[PDB]
Amino acid sequence: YKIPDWFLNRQKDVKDGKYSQVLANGLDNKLREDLERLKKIRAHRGLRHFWGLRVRGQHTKTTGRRGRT
Amino acid sequence: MLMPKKNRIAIYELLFKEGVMVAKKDVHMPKHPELADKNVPNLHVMKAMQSLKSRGYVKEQFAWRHFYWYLTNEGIQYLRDYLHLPPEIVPATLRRS
Amino acid sequence: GHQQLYWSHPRKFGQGSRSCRVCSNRHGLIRKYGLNMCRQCFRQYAKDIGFIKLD
Amino acid sequence: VQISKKRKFVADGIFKAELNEFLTRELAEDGYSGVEVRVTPTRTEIIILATRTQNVLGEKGRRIRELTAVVQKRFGFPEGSVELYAEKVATRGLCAIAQAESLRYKLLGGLAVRRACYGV
Amino acid sequence: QSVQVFGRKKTATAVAHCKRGNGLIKVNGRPLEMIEPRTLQYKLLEPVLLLGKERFAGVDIRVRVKGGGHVAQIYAIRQSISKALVAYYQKYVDEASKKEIKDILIQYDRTLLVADPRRCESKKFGGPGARARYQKSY
Amino acid sequence: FRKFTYRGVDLDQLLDMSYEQLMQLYSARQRRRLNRGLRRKQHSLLKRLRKAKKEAPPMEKPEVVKTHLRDMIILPEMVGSMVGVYNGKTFNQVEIKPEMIGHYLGEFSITYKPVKHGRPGIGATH
RNA sequence: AGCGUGUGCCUACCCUACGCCGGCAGGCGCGGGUAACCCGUUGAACCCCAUUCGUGAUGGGGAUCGGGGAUUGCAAUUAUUCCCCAUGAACGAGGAAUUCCCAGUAAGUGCGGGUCAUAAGCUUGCGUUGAUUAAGUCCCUGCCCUUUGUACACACCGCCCGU
RNA sequence: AGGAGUGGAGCCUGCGGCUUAAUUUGACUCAACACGGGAAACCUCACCCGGCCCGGACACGGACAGGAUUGACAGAUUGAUA
């Protein structure tokens, strides 16, 4: 329909140019956290993404004990 | 002292021509509501008259962020002792009988 | 310079731009209804201004 | 100049308070008691109630002239649109402002504090 | 002159212009048990099963019914009909028949003339609300 | 391995071949930031970048640059070119790639280090 | 809903309607309001309603956390900024230790004011849905009114006895 | 013999000692600890990687035409169109 598609899961996305098809399930969390580019750009937000810390920055000590556990 | 001289002479002339004023307690402020439009920037003018009345030999009356100065005989006496200009340039004080 | 520095990137949240109209103090300001008094000076002058404690 | 009713009333109260404080510290030595403001068409009068009016007006009304001048030049009143008077208070012994000032000047003027307070 | 207090309760109001007219059976202008919220729809069917069809051939009660809140807008229609019958019977024949139908309606249920006086109360110092206080540490 | 293409697009011409897609294939995160407007002090980082890219050929990093400036660049695609930034007390550089749109230029300094832990005893610790 | 706020004296940092139509707050215009007058019958609303579970780890409630256009802020990341795709959150009463509370109350829920540039997870108010328990006692913690003892009066965190 | 709301199931702040530089001043039982209306990028910040502008009525030492204060991103200071 040539509609700019805001109905889909991942636009602009890495690992596939168009809204193409890829195989195997069990990886949706990985597909929402792309591990290659963030690791290769040497980012501290990269350590937020990778170590399990808060890439947005919720507060963790007692509250925010769901999100990294 | 943080004061120039040209604006100083101009402010002495303005103070001669007016004599009795009310001023706010500011130092670096060039925008005073009731003391604008003197052909000179208001920062130098307003601080200048504050320093003119606050040398150490003229009194004041101040609170609520505002200086009140009435022409006593100390004002005129210091006028004589410092500027040495006689009052025959008639001030605004010799009227309203 | 004065004109090369003033109002260049605006002070759209100036906190040192206001002070109590009575004591020249910057903390506890009450700008509601244009009072521009610190809270202590306002408690001092409230009866004179017209604010009274009914409840 | 258009201003909201709440802001207008609050500014009127602020003006009354500032004027009261200014002339309190100006002429409390002259038995200052209180100030009242009457705003009427083209007539904005300031009545200064004080115990002694000899120095409130001064000689030939000099002090009243200076007070009017400073009030007009500070609060931005139009020239000659404010005239401030001075009238005595009939009962000086029922005003705590006047009597606290009197006790202050009896304490400053030299007197045993118990004697000055019991006299008051 | 004109005596008109209509019906009201809590917040809502059924302006009841009482006069002569068609006076069909309608609530918010709508049928007997047909109201969309569908919760308290029987409260008006009860009385009209006793007198007969002739009695409501000349009582037009034009109602402006405005107000959100069931316990307000409902329970105000009963007040409104009670006052309508009261005024009609008082003005037309005598207050003895008004005495009788008001007796059955009001001794039937107390809560027409009386509303709930309960209302949200003021919040106070050092607490999230009226009575609760902030947690005190030691 | 061999070089991987950039979505099959051509970068031969600065304007006609590339930079046509402001948002068509390019994400947010400097989608509008570049269009916030302009101020003074902006072109000095770009001038130092042009110096460090012209005087110094590729495959050879230039002399050390150490400035804080966090600025807006009307373009967030800068291949063979990095902004070596002093942050905190130290200096940081990041190996850039021609896949940039989708991130910031200031999110690379680890400033939330685990602060020093004490040895609480004597009393009660739980 | 109701409590309220809102602009030209240093406030050129006010509240906003209506038209910009990438999908609506929105960077552009054009108007209203110094206010029971305009926002406003209060500009991406509660509780409710066959997206529905005839039982319950599912549709039923949000587990880090990516986008489509960005309220437009000297930085924001080293506190501003807006719906969603189902990859499961110990997903259905909680260590000794404790705080608050008696009806339109607790609790849930949002909206104003202050701070302020729209600045809130703070506070101060306002509504809205709306109870369970109790109409008692001096057991704990304390207070008060009497009698009583005291070697205390710095007043029991007192005074004081013996290597 | 009562309970309701669980400091651990649905959004951060105040304070107490130490990483070269951070846990930035009063208040510490009730009667301190989103309290100072204290939501600090500047401004009222003052544990900030280094500092520059100004101070002078009373007794003062170097007793006047330069004895240099704030405006250049380029071949630099550890930031700093000083």
Side-chain angles (χ1 to χ4, degrees):
Chain A
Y1 297 94
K2 287 323 289 149
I3 292 162
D5 282 339
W6 85 291
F7 330 128
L8 258 84
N9 309 36
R10 258 268 220 173
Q11 331 122 41
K12 77 99 187 154
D13 191 19
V14 60
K15 312 169 301 313
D16 59 325
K18 203 197 45 177
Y19 313 136
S20 196
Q21 166 174 47
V22 281
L23 263 161
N25 84 86
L27 213 62
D28 218 43
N29 182 90
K30 293 297 185 82
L31 310 162
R32 313 286 86 74
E33 318 278 301
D34 186 86
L35 316 104
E36 63 259 10
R37 158 177 182 191
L38 83 83
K39 270 174 180 298
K40 294 196 83 172
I41 65 179
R42 191 240 185 147
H44 73 77
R45 79 90 173 228
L47 281 176
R48 308 279 271 207
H49 267 315
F50 155 75
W51 262 353
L53 283 179
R54 325 217 53 61
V55 108
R56 300 334 298 135
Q58 289 64 347
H59 264 277
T60 84
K61 84 177 307 172
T62 344
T63 172
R65 80 215 105 196
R66 312 242 37 90
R68 57 191 206 153
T69 337
Chain B
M1 183 31 48
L2 177 78
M3 302 195 84
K5 200 156 176 176
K6 178 75 154 165
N7 318 87
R8 207 190 303 262
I9 317 273
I11 198 60
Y12 287 101
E13 283 269 340
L14 169 55
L15 270 286
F16 211 123
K17 94 211 269 183
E18 167 83 293
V20 161
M21 47 270 303
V22 46
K24 233 197 93 163
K25 190 177 158 163
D26 321 55
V27 176
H28 286 28
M29 302 285 344
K31 203 63 61 180
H32 181 268
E34 287 293 349
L35 194 126
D37 196 31
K38 268 90 184 316
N39 263 316
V40 197
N42 206 1
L43 156 51
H44 281 159
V45 166
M46 186 297 246
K47 158 172 176 194
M49 101 195 59
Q50 181 252 298
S51 175
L52 295 198
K53 315 248 210 293
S54 95
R55 183 47 265 171
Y57 323 104
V58 191
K59 299 215 309 170
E60 41 203 285
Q61 172 43 250
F62 147 86
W64 269 70
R65 298 250 263 158
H66 263 283
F67 272 126
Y68 291 88
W69 286 299
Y70 40 87
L71 202 41
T72 92
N73 293 20
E74 167 90 59
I76 279 172
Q77 182 68 275
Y78 190 85
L79 165 82
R80 171 190 85 101
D81 277 330
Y82 189 73
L83 175 78
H84 313 103
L85 253 174
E88 205 37 64
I89 290 96
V90 61
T93 80
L94 280 178
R95 259 202 298 216
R96 317 283 88 200
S97 39
Chain C
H2 180 68
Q3 270 184 228
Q4 271 323 103
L5 264 62
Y6 218 59
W7 200 239
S8 38
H9 233 162
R11 270 189 148 171
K12 330 175 82 93
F13 31 101
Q15 207 253 41
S17 38
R18 335 174 203 90
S19 34
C20 169
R21 69 159 83 239
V22 186
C23 67
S24 156
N25 200 357
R26 326 217 92 150
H27 307 92
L29 251 272
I30 305 185
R31 325 152 54 170
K32 198 179 191 183
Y33 314 121
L35 277 168
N36 303 14
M37 293 177 207
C38 61
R39 42 142 173 150
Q40 296 103 342
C41 282
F42 171 76
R43 260 176 46 76
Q44 185 169 295
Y45 285 102
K47 220 198 272 282
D48 268 8
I49 293 158
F51 291 95
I52 71 154
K53 288 206 39 154
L54 291 155
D55 170 58
Chain D
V1 164
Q2 56 281 2
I3 198 191
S4 34
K5 273 315 197 144
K6 321 178 206 170
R7 230 186 335 163
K8 198 263 290 303
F9 272 73
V10 164
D12 157 48
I14 286 150
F15 152 80
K16 259 146 169 312
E18 175 169 3
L19 161 84
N20 194 325
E21 173 69 18
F22 151 68
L23 49 55
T24 278
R25 52 187 44 261
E26 164 64 34
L27 63 96
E29 318 229 21
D30 319 334
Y32 175 63
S33 266
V35 65
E36 16 184 359
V37 181
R38 310 194 249 200
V39 167
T40 46
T42 70
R43 288 294 266 250
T44 40
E45 313 110 29
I46 298 176
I47 306 97
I48 300 155
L49 319 175
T51 86
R52 71 209 281 310
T53 333
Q54 179 160 12
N55 293 355
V56 166
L57 326 164
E59 82 277 68
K60 63 196 304 272
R62 284 212 30 213
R63 192 83 165 299
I64 208 75
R65 258 193 63 225
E66 315 175 346
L67 290 204
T68 318
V70 297
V71 167
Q72 174 243 0
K73 257 170 282 164
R74 148 77 182 114
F75 297 102
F77 281 101
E79 213 296 316
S81 211
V82 46
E83 55 277 61
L84 48 94
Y85 305 107
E87 104 189 294
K88 246 180 96 165
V89 46
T91 56
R92 147 189 48 253
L94 296 145
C95 182
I97 296 279
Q99 298 286 162
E101 209 50 41
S102 164
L103 174 67
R104 167 216 277 258
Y105 286 133
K106 271 197 304 226
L107 285 189
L108 262 194
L111 189 38
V113 308
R114 57 172 218 110
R115 221 49 192 130
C117 292
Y118 275 130
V120 169
Chain E
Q1 220 189 279
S2 208
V3 186
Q4 288 179 358
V5 81
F6 59 65
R8 63 137 169 297
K9 225 182 163 323
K10 220 153 172 171
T11 49
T13 165
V15 188
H17 153 227
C18 156
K19 185 240 284 211
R20 54 142 308 279
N22 308 42
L24 206 37
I25 296 320
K26 79 302 171 193
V27 191
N28 264 36
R30 312 148 193 211
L32 285 91
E33 34 193 77
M34 180 290 207
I35 268 173
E36 283 317 307
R38 286 176 308 275
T39 283
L40 289 191
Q41 76 283 58
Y42 286 168
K43 293 338 208 287
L44 195 74
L45 203 293
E46 220 188 352
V48 294
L49 297 187
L50 208 80
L51 304 184
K53 313 267 188 155
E54 176 253 333
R55 292 314 209 163
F56 48 90
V59 194
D60 218 22
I61 164 175
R62 160 168 81 133
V63 281
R64 266 174 292 279
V65 190
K66 184 261 160 223
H70 291 359
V71 198
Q73 87 66 8
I74 300 145
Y75 306 92
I77 60 200
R78 55 118 177 266
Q79 206 168 348
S80 206
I81 186 191
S82 151
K83 312 288 188 292
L85 264 85
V86 150
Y88 197 83
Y89 292 29
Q90 153 189 188
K91 189 51 200 74
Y92 272 22
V93 61
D94 67 340
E95 279 199 283
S97 206
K98 100 87 190 173
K99 195 186 298 103
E100 175 172 84
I101 38 64
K102 207 198 67 99
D103 268 31
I104 181 61
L105 281 206
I106 315 315
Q107 299 199 333
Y108 167 34
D109 30 59
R110 145 190 192 278
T111 321
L112 337 93
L113 275 58
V114 278
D116 261 38
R118 291 178 302 163
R119 270 171 190 63
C120 201
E121 97 164 41
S122 208
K123 183 222 189 266
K124 258 77 81 168
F125 283 1
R131 303 276 221 269
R133 306 287 83 164
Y134 293 135
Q135 175 159 343
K136 183 213 208 97
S137 38
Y138 284 110
Chain F
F1 214 54
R2 289 186 278 263
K3 187 71 152 181
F4 202 54
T5 180
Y6 190 9
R7 313 212 204 163
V9 83
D10 199 16
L11 315 167
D12 286 356
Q13 303 184 227
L14 296 177
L15 294 173
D16 302 349
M17 290 304 180
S18 58
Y19 202 52
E20 288 285 340
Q21 21 101 205
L22 265 303
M23 31 69 61
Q24 303 289 151
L25 290 175
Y26 268 173
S27 27
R29 249 31 44 194
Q30 292 265 353
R31 173 192 55 218
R32 175 205 67 163
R33 169 58 190 281
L34 39 79
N35 200 250
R36 148 152 198 73
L38 58 130
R39 307 96 55 215
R40 62 175 304 176
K41 227 97 72 72
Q42 190 181 124
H43 278 129
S44 277
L45 271 150
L46 202 33
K47 210 226 83 164
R48 198 88 168 66
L49 258 165
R50 272 291 190 199
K51 176 219 291 183
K53 204 188 177 186
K54 170 189 55 60
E55 214 174 277
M59 266 270 165
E60 164 199 342
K61 272 170 170 171
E63 224 158 351
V64 190
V65 298
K66 342 181 285 185
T67 189
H68 258 317
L69 266 190
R70 316 229 283 275
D71 286 345
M72 157 217 308
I73 313 186
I74 322 269
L75 150 107
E77 198 287 81
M78 7 253 192
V79 39
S81 46
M82 71 298 304
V83 184
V85 175
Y86 144 75
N87 288 330
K89 66 191 300 171
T90 41
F91 337 117
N92 33 304
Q93 69 203 299
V94 154
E95 189 205 296
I96 37 66
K97 288 305 274 169
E99 315 198 31
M100 287 281 344
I101 278 278
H103 201 14
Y104 283 90
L105 284 189
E107 290 190 77
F108 305 96
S109 282
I110 287 147
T111 45
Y112 47 67
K113 151 179 176 169
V115 291
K116 211 169 72 93
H117 289 251
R119 280 303 308 151
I122 292 106
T125 48
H126 68 324

